[PDB]
């Protein structure tokens, strides 16, 4: 019985606890810690995959491309607060012609 099947988790909570142990970060890791790490990573993954599913829905393509992920990460102010500095490979840029040139 793994620690993931004790809470319905899918992200590898035992592996994550192992990388926190043998990963030059801290000394002790509580039992309530890596299930919560698995929880917040699962929430972030569910948010970005739902945004990618919407981006695949409204763009009539049944697959996930990096342009869809770039339009996911750049058209949300919470995602511009979180990851407004990093970029996506082959993601392109935001199509926004300014009003003064129009």
């Amino acid at each position: 019985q793994s620690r993931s099947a004790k809470a319905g988790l899918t992200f590898p909570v035992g592996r994550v606890h192992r990388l926190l142990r043998r990963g030059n970060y801290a000394q002790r890791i509580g039992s309530g810690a890596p299930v919560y790490l698995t929880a917040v990573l699962e929430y972030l993954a569910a948010e970005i995959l739902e945004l990618a599913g919407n981006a695949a829905r409204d763009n009539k393509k049944t697959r996930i491309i990096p342009r869809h992920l770039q339009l996911a990460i750049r058209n949300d102010d919470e995602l511009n607060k979180l990851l407004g500095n990093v970029t996506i490979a082959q993601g392109g840029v935001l199509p926004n012609i300014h009003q003064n040139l129009l």
């Binding site: 990096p66 500095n85 990093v86 970029t87 996506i88 490979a89 840029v93 926004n96 012609i97 300014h98 040139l101």
Partner: protein, 79 residues
């Protein structure tokens, strides 16, 4: 010369990606100079990474670590 390999219509298409109506003839040399400066500023760290590692291949892991060190992190090539 290899600094003029990125020619005038290349920077024109880059500006049309960035949304410019009309551009001037003084832009291209300063664009190439700031591109050489940014390339030097990332390549110095990216080659000190591969010079410490007893290697001669500038690996993609080394350039994404050097990009993460200098703020502008990429996704997909490690990390």
């Amino acid at each position: 010369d290899n600094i003029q390999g990125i020619t005038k219509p290349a920077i024109r298409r880059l500006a049309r990606r960035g949304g410019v109506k009309r551009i001037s003839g003084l832009i291209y040399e300063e664009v190439r100079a700031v591109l050489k400066s940014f390339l030097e500023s990332v390549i110095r760290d990216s080659v000190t990474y591969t010079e410490h590692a007893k290697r001669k291949t500038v690996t993609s892991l080394d350039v994404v670590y050097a990009l993460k060190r200098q703020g502008r992190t990429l996704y997909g090539f490690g990390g």
